[PDB]
Design a protein. Structure first.
Ligand code: CLA
Ligand code: CLA
Ligand code: CLA
Ligand code: CLA
Ligand code: CLA
Ligand code: CLA
Ligand SMILES: CCCCCCCCCCCCCCCCCC(=O)OC[C@H](CO[C@@H]1O[C@H](CO)[C@H](O)[C@H](O)[C@H]1O)OC(=O)CCCCCCCCCCCCCCCCC
Ligand SMILES: CCCCCCCCCCCCCCCCCC(=O)OC[C@H](CO[C@@H]1O[C@H](CO)[C@H](O)[C@H](O)[C@H]1O)OC(=O)CCCCCCCCCCCCCCCCC
Ligand SMILES: CC1=C(/C=C/C(C)=C/C=C/C(C)=C/C=C/C=C(C)/C=C/C=C(C)/C=C/C2=C(C)CCCC2(C)C)C(C)(C)CCC1
Ligand SMILES: CC1=C(/C=C/C(C)=C/C=C/C(C)=C/C=C/C=C(C)/C=C/C=C(C)/C=C/C2=C(C)CCCC2(C)C)C(C)(C)CCC1
Ligand SMILES: CC1=C(\C=C/C(C)=C/C=C/C(C)=C/C=C/C=C(C)/C=C/C=C(C)/C=C/C2=C(C)CCCC2(C)C)C(C)(C)CCC1
Ligand code: OEC
Ligand SMILES: [Ca+2]
Ligand SMILES: [Cl-]
Ligand SMILES: [Fe+2]
Lengths: 37, 28, 34, 447, 82, 335, 340, 62, 35
């Protein structure tokens, strides 16, 4: 497991891996906002 | 127990960094 | 007037949440195996 | 600056083909995504990692990669110190911020083009000199990297050797095979059953040794390209465009994706069954072992035992005469593994060693690997498609093999797509046939 | 290229819509939720509760074996605390 | 002679050939001819093959008691596995035919040629100044042949587990596959039928709509097809009348009005769908099988409440339990 | 006249065209879809098949279904107010009343829909080749969900409305009918598979033989919605396939009719095969083959192999697939190979 | 030291959160990034230090 | 039998050589316009 100290951040690290996917999604948010040029 | 609090913030963060740009109008 | 791109992105996430709720239920509800 | 009057939205990134500056931001921001994943995932794996439990039973694919390099493991793949795992994870995750910074910067702040803000970094796709030079740069960077592995193996600690004399353990390689006849021989090896081409590597000496050759060869070619230009044939054969160069690298990755798929599925050495699961053949071999071991203890003479077909219940012959395991496992008689080898003789499986040299650690090893075959469902239910829910498991060898085949294939499609476009873009009809000068209308009727 | 109906784009964007639907849409959601959570759904469709597939000891299935006296037969299946 | 080799290259590349022998053709034509000839002779006259390597020869040729439906070319022996088995690797042809020699010769030559066939579908398009990507559409059926003839055997460790070259033999491959992998319960397969069903659907869709909105240029007692001449300037059908109808069938915005967006969709859907189904076989070649919902829903006590997924499992066991009768000696089928 | 005023209103060009057909279509179509989505989440199949079939019980999108009625029901229409349910709704659900509900309503919905095709075509003034085509899906639904069980013992052996529940219908037909060996089915797949080829190949052909009518790379905008010239080179398309395949189209009017013919004809052939399976008149065996296999224990074909698979399918599935039979098959009577 | 570690580590998180949102809108809207070139620099500089703090401070907690 | 192997190998070499030296012979040139 995570080193005794960082254990507080255990829940945080549980979500981090998925973040890259969001970037792929974000790019679509942007294009929608700029009215798909 | 409920790290859904995390996702929530980092999730709305994405659209925020472009929403603020729709407010300050520029460079989209 | 509410900007369309906001309507979709909010309704978009709103869909990912409920459907994601479904996938969680696959490991907890009656649809489990435990 | 760039909008609909360049490309469509769904082809947006193609608007950056001639925007060196912004096109660098992409690559720097992208490279951050790769470092981010590697980092954040390692920490995710460690956070779930259970020391007194097999790695392959925990859905790990990065921590076993670190383990192979001799880090945090010991005798028999026993996990000693989880700190190196934590380090490799956090360091990456940090570096992702540094790269991500530059990426974002160059994409929305910095010069939209490079040619003027610096002639050294600015480039022209048709500039065969700049292209071969930038290529030369990366050919060195990769070259040093190949040597970074050699260093870790020979000096900074070693690697996990499953073939360890005293049994699987981290070993310092201090005798790399440098014989070219041996090294480059692998390249001349068949890709079929038995002769396994590159995947047939079975000792760290060759691995470390081969990396020495590659490392030097790569840098050597790196320097060559800095101080040269494409020849004559080299220019009259290829297409020189931003897309064309992409296509060439796309098929390259596709080919490497297929090779990697077969590596994680077949190879035992650079993919230890202690960290990953047992390989496909290894598992089927283990079952024959297991029940040969059982039944023999019940007083059965395995050597002369006759199966339903009259072929040999436990032991039979390979097409070239070697004594092998019986049953459907006759297809995996090409398997070699630390646990099984001490039973092998000069003609294959020795009936005498089988009869009284079977060791307890081998029996339970066979049992382990037998009960952990790379068989599973998408929802991760270990076993045959007809198994019952209970054992939540899918061999890491299965995850990796499948994922990288899908990627390798689609990249071959991406290759074809981008190579076909480049040929038409160059010649100049990638946007339709000229209504006026329609080529076909100028050719004789074959009818 | 147009008909009488008010262009969706305008309606989904109008503040008036959301002032309405911020009430209506969740309302239906909560209603459907209660429909299940109050166990009413179980009775509306005669769907067995997790503790209502068999009797305690019985391991046989309440298969309906004749059409005309099926309803009566079904009721009899509920009798054995099933 | 302007230069023999220069002329040769000009002839090969020539777009004035009845059939475009390309540079890919130089490899395709011979390989496809060996495959076909060997196939035809085998399917008719080849002797029984010990497919499972258990000395249990399976006859699949016409002359040996088969008909078109049952007849097939039997995969190489399981004793051979993934080993390369050319004719010059056998003591005799008798031996070569017994261990399923022809099979490898065919599949290898076909897959090679069928790949160059894709390569040629680019070349000719290049020589004629038209856009590529037609070959990209053909990559989907080819990727399936690859998955069924090469990828799955590699994954499973033997060419004997590759799909046989025959009708009924193809049925065996499927039935068994379902047993060992539960393919019907796999997303990639489901995407495949979606592409295949939708394909046939859209093929009929497009077909009908177009043929139904044809401009009148024919007599009442004259074929409506003659109202079109090869090499027309203008269109032969009213696409605006087509869109007007289909737009009213469902609703306007759910209807195509752009022929280019139409034909792209017509091409994209099945190709993409089949691509996944090909990836499905290639994925389940490494035993990453379909969803396993066996004994999922259970009651409050713990009794197992069956679903259709369980009824599927019973059918699957029966396949599993009966297939390759005498080939298994041990409890688990890990091969 | 009120009729022509009623007509006027119906045939008015709206967002969603109603029409006379709509009076039949929309009510049934909605009830069919609604009935499924209802049963899918709420109604069980415990008292009818001894199965869980709804989200409420724990099934997922794949395993959910609206299962057929009991075999006891026979071919009963299972009306809500019929002798079985006796007006009761809860009982009606438990007796699989929703199945005949979905089936019959959906049946009329398919009638209304083709009528819509006919009605709309007439108004717009276009040829009804869209209605002719839609006959293939009708034949299939009619043959499989109605005619087939009408030949069997009851509605019970009809395909249940659901993902997995359809998969068993496939495995069943293999095991019991040897459906893959049927000539009519083979023509079926040939049409679907061949139809999915035509779809692909034609689309790809057109997109890659296009003329340049714009200055952008994304050639989609560069299309003229108002006819005029052909958007793609038919002549180039012709010479291409003529050199790579040897054969090629040269009459857009025939090419498109061909795209109608192939998949529609296939579906119709597959329908006929199913109509024969209703009377169990299957294409199960080859007599010449069986006679040799009996006398000669060394004669083996891939055909013989498959039949053994069927025997296994029938034996191991029948008990839980046909509860009404009260099947009891001892372990020793179960056909099994070695080890497995 | 322990709390001091949790302070630095947690603060490093909130700063990054602020930085990750900050830098984008900074470079984007050209209303400045010259007054924000001051802000960004201080955030970037501080960030590195924080990482080095948590770095050395780690071998003291775990 | 050892002969057949040789024959085949020679044959395959021929076509493979024809293929490599083929695209090498300035293939991009061979096309309607720009070359
Ligand atoms: C090194 C890899 C690489 C690179 C750098 C490029 C670069 C490029 N490609 Mg490309 N391509 C690649 C691999 C690559 N490709 C592969 C492997 C394929 C085969 C599938 C393709 C197929 C392809 C096509 C068909 C096209 C391009 C195009 C382009 C250009 C415009 C970019 C674009 O359309 O972005 C836009 C990006 C998107 C619209 C995103 C697509 C999203 C994908 C399809 C979904 C991925 C699924 C994901 C894993 C699931 C996430 C779950 C989700 C819920 C979050 C650009 C030069 C276009 C062009 O102009 O050609 C020159 C074009 O038409 N490429
Ligand atoms: C790997 C993913 C990736 C990357 C790196 C890029 C990169 C780029 N794209 Mg792009 N794109 C992508 C995927 C990607 N794309 C996909 C999948 C699609 C299809 C939907 C597109 C469609 C697309 C179009 C249509 C266009 C681009 C353009 C561009 C370029 C200019 C970006 C821009 O307009 O800034 C605008 C920036 C903003 C509106 C603000 C966004 C916020 C920033 C960028 C993200 C912040 C990251 C993180 C949260 C902050 C970390 C801070 C921390 C380090 C401190 C840039 C090089 C444009 C181009 O050609 O350049 C001229 C263009 O027109 N893209
Ligand atoms: C590609 C490399 C790769 C490989 C081999 C793995 C392998 C693994 N991951 Mg992993 N992962 C990856 C990339 C990868 N991951 C990435 C990029 C992310 C970031 C989002 C993650 C995030 C992640 C998390 C958060 C977790 C894992 C876990 C796991 C393990 C369990 C696998 C599982 O249950 O997944 C099953 C997943 C699926 C069945 C989804 C398949 C999705 C496919 C690819 C979609 C294809 C559709 C297609 C794209 C549609 C496009 C078509 C359209 C354009 C028309 C396994 C060892 C788990 C673990 O370690 O627990 C043991 C876990 O909790 N991974
Ligand atoms: C793919 C990598 C890459 C490349 C090719 C460039 C290229 C460029 N950057 Mg840049 N940058 C990058 C990554 C990269 N950057 C990253 C990751 C960041 C985030 C920290 C930045 C942040 C950044 C800023 C803030 C600025 C630039 C600028 C520039 C341009 C001027 C050159 C310069 O500043 O160098 C000058 C420095 C050197 C020549 C020497 C640097 C050597 C470093 C200290 C050592 C690197 C070690 C390396 C990792 C290992 C290699 C050794 C190995 C071979 C053994 C140039 C086009 C400037 C610009 O836009 O001007 C036009 C500018 O103001 N960059
Ligand atoms: C990945 C890194 C990389 C890349 C992209 C390039 C790219 C290039 N190199 Mg190169 N090179 C590299 C690394 C690299 N080099 C290294 C490390 C060295 C040192 C050994 C060299 C030494 C080198 C020399 C000496 C020359 C080049 C040349 C060239 C150019 C033409 C290549 C060509 O036409 O090949 C096309 C290849 C063929 C037509 C032959 C095909 C036959 C192949 C080899 C066998 C079949 C492959 C098979 C499918 C794979 C199976 C594996 C096999 C072992 C069985 C091109 C720009 C040439 C040039 O223009 O000089 C500037 C040149 O003369 N390179
Ligand atoms: C017009 C659309 C339409 C059509 C064609 C149908 C058709 C059908 N529905 Mg249905 N339904 C509809 C709309 C429709 N529904 C709507 C909108 C609802 C929601 C309220 C329902 C709710 C519903 C339920 C709840 C049930 C059906 C059922 C049925 C089926 C049997 C009903 C029956 O016996 O008909 C009877 C036919 C008639 C009454 C027509 C009579 C017309 C004549 C001209 C009038 C004569 C009356 C006069 C008094 C006779 C004098 C003679 C004298 C000797 C007494 C049948 C397939 C049942 C079913 O599916 O069973 C499985 C069932 O249980 N429907
Ligand atoms: C207005 C527009 C709406 C029009 C609706 C038309 C109907 C659309 C199809 C309805 C799909 C329902 C799916 C659903 O309900 O799943 C709902 C289920 C419910 O989930 C289940 O909950 C149960 C509760 O006990 C159990 O816990 C199970 O474990 C759990 O899986 O979710 C799933 O897990 C499946 C994910 C959804 C996948 C749907 C993909 C459909 C793709 C095909 C599309 C049709 C072509
Ligand atoms: C029988 C048919 C019953 C139809 C019942 C009503 C359905 C309502 C649909 C509303 C959607 C719509 O209007 O278009 C929404 C928009 C059209 O946008 C339109 O813009 C117009 C501008 O003048 C008007 O504003 C319209 O109001 C607006 O709808 O999308 C379209 O361009 C194409 C939609 C095609 C959808 C086909 C089904 C595919 C669904 C995708 C789901 C897979 C994920
Ligand atoms: C916090 C934190 C962190 C992280 C950071 C990051 C990296 C972030 C990112 C973030 C992000 C990056 C986010 C994003 C998001 C996105 C999203 C969320 C999206 C969505 C989308 C949608 C919803 C869509 C929609 C749509 C549709 C559906 C249709 C079409 C149209 C549109 C497109 C509109 C760190 C590490 C420092 C540490 C810890 C803390
Ligand atoms: C029965 C009956 C009836 C009827 C009723 C009705 C009609 C109902 C309806 C109902 C309904 C009408 C329902 C609905 C539902 C729906 C749903 C439930 C949906 C869901 C969806 C989803 C979930 C989605 C998903 C997805 C997709 C698919 C796409 C992709 C993405 C996503 C994920 C989003 C009556 C009374 C008459 C009479 C008696 C009998
Ligand atoms: C261009 C562009 C784009 C892209 C972008 C990108 C790709 C970005 C990237 C970004 C990135 C690449 C970022 C990164 C970040 C990272 C970070 C920010 C880091 C953090 C770290 C930390 C925070 C530390 C520490 C720790 C540990 C050691 C353990 C405990 C926990 C924690 C995590 C705290 C898009 C598509 C959107 C759109 C268009 C434009
Ligand atoms: Mn032909 Ca695939 Mn069932 Mn192990 Mn043999
Ligand atoms: Ca945790
Ligand atoms: Cl079989
Ligand atoms: Fe067409």
């Amino acid at each position: 497991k995570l080193p005794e100290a960082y254990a507080i951040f255990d829940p945080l690290v549980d979500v981090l891996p998925v973040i890259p996917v969001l970037f792929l999604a974000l790019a679509f948010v942007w294009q929608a906002a700029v009215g798909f040029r | 127990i409920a790290q859904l609090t995390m996702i929530a913030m980092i999730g709305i963060a994405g659209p925020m960094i472009i929403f603020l740009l729709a407010v300050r109008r520029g460079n989209l | 007037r509410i900007p369309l791109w906001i309507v979709a992105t909010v309704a978009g996430m709103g869909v990912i949440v409920i459907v994601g709720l479904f996938f969680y239920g696959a490991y907890a509800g009656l649809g489990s195996s435990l | 600056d760039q909008e609909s009057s360049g490309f469509a939205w769904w082809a947006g990134n193609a608007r950056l083909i001639n925007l060196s500056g912004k096109l660098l931001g992409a690559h720097v921001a992208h490279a951050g995504l790769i470092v981010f994943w590697a980092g954040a995932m390692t920490l995710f794996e460690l956070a779930h990692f259970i020391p007194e439990k097999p790695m392959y039973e925990q859905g790990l694919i990065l921590i076993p990669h670190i383990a192979t390099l001799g880090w945090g493991v010991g005798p028999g793949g026993e996990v000693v110190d989880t700190f190196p795992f934590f380090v490799v994870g956090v360091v990456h995750l940090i570096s992702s911020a540094v790269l991500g910074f530059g990426g974002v910067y160059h994409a929305i702040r910095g010069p939209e083009t490079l040619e003027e803000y610096s002639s050294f970094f600015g480039y022209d796709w048709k500039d065969k000199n700049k292209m071969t030079t930038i290529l030369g740069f990366h050919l060195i960077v990769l070259g040093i990297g190949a040597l970074l592995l050699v260093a870790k193996a020979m000096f900074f600690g070693g690697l996990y050797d499953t073939w360890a004399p005293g049994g699987g353990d981290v070993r310092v390689i201090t005798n790399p095979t440098l014989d070219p006849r041996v090294i480059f021989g692998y390249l001349l090896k068949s890709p079929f059953g038995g002769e396994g081409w590159i995947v047939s590597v079975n000792n760290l000496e060759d691995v470390v040794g081969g990396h020495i050759w590659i490392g030097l060869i790569c840098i050597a070619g790196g320097i060559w390209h800095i101080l040269t230009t494409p020849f004559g044939w080299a220019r009259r054969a290829f297409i020189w465009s931003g897309e064309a160069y992409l296509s060439y690298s796309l098929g390259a990755l596709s080919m490497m994706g297929f090779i990697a798929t077969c590596f994680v599925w077949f190879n035992n050495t650079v993919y230890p069954s202690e960290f990953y699961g047992p390989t496909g053949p290894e598992a089927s071999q283990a079952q024959a072992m297991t029940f040969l071991i059982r039944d023999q203890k019940l007083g059965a003479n395995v050597g002369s035992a006759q199966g339903p077909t009259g072929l040999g219940k436990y032991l039979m012959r390979s097409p070239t005469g070697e004594i092998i395991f019986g049953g459907e496992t006759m297809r995996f008689w090409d398997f070699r593994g630390p646990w099984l080898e001490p039973l092998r003789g000069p003609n294959g499986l020795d009936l005498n060693k089988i009869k009284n040299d079977i060791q307890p650690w081998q029996e339970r090893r066979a049992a382990e690997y037998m009960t952990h075959a790379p068989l599973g469902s998408l929802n991760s239910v270990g076993g045959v498609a007809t198994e019952i829910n209970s054992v939540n498991f899918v061999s890491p060898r299965s995850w990796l093999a499948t994922s990288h085949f899908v990627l390798a294939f689609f990249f071959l499609v991406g290759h074809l797509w981008h190579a076909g476009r480049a040929r038409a873009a160059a010649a100049g009809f990638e946007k339709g046939i000229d209504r006026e000068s329609e080529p076909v209308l100028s050719m004789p009727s074959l009818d | 290229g147009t008909t009488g109906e008010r262009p969706f784009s305008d309606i989904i964007t109008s503040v008036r819509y959301w002032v309405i639907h911020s009430i209506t849409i969740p309302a239906l959601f909560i209603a459907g939720w209660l429909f299940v959570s109050t166990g009413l759904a179980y009775d509306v469709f005669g769907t067995p509760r997790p503790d209502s597939y068999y009797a305690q000891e019985q391991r046989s299935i309440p298969l309906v074996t004749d059409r005309f006296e099926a309803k009566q037969q079904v009721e009899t299946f509920l009798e054995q605390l099933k | 002679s302007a230069n023999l080799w220069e002329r040769f290259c000009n002839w090969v590349t020539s777009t004035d050939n009845r059939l475009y022998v390309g540079w890919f053709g130089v490899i395709m034509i011979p390989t496809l001819l060996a495959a076909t000839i060997c196939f035809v002779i085998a399917f008719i006259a080849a002797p029984p093959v010990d497919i499972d390597g258990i000395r249990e020869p399976v006859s699949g040729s016409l002359l040996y008691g088969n008909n078109i439906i049952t007849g097939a070319v039997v995969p190489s022996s399981n004793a051979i596995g993934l080993h390369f088995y050319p004719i010059w690797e056998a003591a005799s042809l008798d031996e070569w035919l017994y261990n399923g020699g022809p099979y490898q010769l065919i599949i290898f030559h076909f897959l090679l040629g069928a790949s160059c066939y894709m390569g040629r579908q680019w070349e000719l398009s290049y020589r004629l100044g038209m856009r590529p990507w037609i070959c990209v559409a053909y990559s989907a059926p080819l990727a399936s042949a690859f998955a069924v003839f090469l990828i799955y055997p590699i994954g499973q460790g033997s060419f004997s587990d590759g799909m046989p070259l025959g009708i009924s033999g193809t049925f065996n491959f499927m039935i068994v596959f379902q047993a060992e992998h539960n393919i019907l319960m796999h997303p990639f397969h489901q995407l495949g039928v979606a592409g295949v069903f939708g394909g046939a659907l859209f093929c009929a869709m497009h077909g009908s709509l177009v043929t139904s909105s044809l401009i009148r240029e024919t007599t009442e007692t004259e074929s409506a097809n003659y109202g079109y001449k090869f090499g027309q300037e203008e269109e032969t059908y009213n696409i605006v009348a087509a869109h007007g109808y289909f737009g009213r069938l469902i609703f306007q915005y759910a209807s195509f009005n752009n022929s280019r967006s139409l034909h792209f969709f017509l091409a994209a859907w099945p190709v993409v769908g089949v691509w996944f189904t090909a990836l499905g076989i290639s994925t389940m070649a490494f035993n990453l099988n379909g969803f396993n919902f066996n004994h999922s829903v259970i009651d409050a006590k713990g009794n197992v409440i069956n679903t259709w997924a369980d009824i599927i499992n019973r059918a699957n066991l029966g396949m599993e339990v009966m297939h390759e009768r005498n080939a298994h000696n041990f409890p688990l089928d890990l091969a | 006249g009120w009729f022509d005023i009623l007509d006027d209103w119906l045939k008015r060009d709206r967002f969603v065209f109603v029409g006379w057909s709509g009076i039949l279509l929309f009510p049934c179509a909605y009830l069919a879809l609604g009935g499924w989505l209802t049963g899918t989440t709420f109604v069980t199949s415990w008292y009818t098949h001894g199965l869980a079939s709804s989200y409420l019980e724990g099934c997922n999108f794949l395993t959910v279904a609206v299962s057929t009625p009991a075999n006891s029901m026979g071919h009963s229409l299972l009306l809500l107010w019929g002798p079985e349910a006796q007006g009761d709704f809860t009982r009606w659900c438990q007796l699989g009343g929703l199945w005949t509900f979905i089936a019959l309503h959906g049946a009329f919905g398919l009638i209304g829909f083709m009528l819509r095709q006919f009605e709309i075509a007439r108004l717009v003034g276009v040829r009804p080749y869209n209605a002719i085509a839609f006959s293939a899906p009708i034949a299939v639904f009619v043959s499989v969900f109605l005619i087939y069980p009408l030949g069997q013992s009851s509605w019970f052996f009809a395909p249940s409305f659901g993902v997995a529940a359809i998969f068993r219908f496939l495995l069943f037909f293999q095991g019991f009918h040897n459906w893959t060996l049927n000539p009519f089915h083979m023509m079926g797949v040939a049409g679907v598979l061949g139809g999915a080829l035509l779809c692909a190949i034609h689309g790809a052909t057109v997109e890659n033989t296009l003329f340049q009518d714009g200055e952008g790379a994304s050639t989609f905008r560069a299309f003229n919605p108002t006819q005029a010239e052909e958007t793609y080179s038919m002549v180039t398309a012709n010479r291409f396939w003529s050199q790579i395949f040897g054969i090629a189209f040269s009459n857009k009017r025939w090419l498109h009719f061909f795209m109608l013919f192939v998949p529609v004809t296939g579906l119709w052939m597959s329908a006929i095969g199913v109509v024969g399976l209703a009377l169990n008149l299957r294409s199960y065996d080859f007599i010449s083959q069986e006679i040799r296999a009996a006398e000669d224990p060394e004669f083996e074909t891939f055909y013989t192999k498959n039949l053994l698979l069927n025997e296994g399918i029938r034996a191991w599935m029948a008990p839980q697939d046909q509860p009404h039979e009260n099947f009891v098959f001892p372990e020793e009577v179960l056909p099994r190979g070695n080890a497995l | 030291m322990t709390i001091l570690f949790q302070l630095a580590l947690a603060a490093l998180v909130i700063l990054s959160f602020v930085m990750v949102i900050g830098v984008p809108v900074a470079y984007a809207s050209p209303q400045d990034w010259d007054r924000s070139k001051q802000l960004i620099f201080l955030g970037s500089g501080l960030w590195i230090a924080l990482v080095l703090v948590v770095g050395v401070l780690n071998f003291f907690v775990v | 039998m050892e002969t057949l192997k040789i024959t085949v190998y020679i044959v395959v070499t021929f076509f493979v050589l024809l293929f490599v030296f083929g695209f090498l012979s300035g293939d991009p040139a061979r096309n309607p316009k720009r070359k």
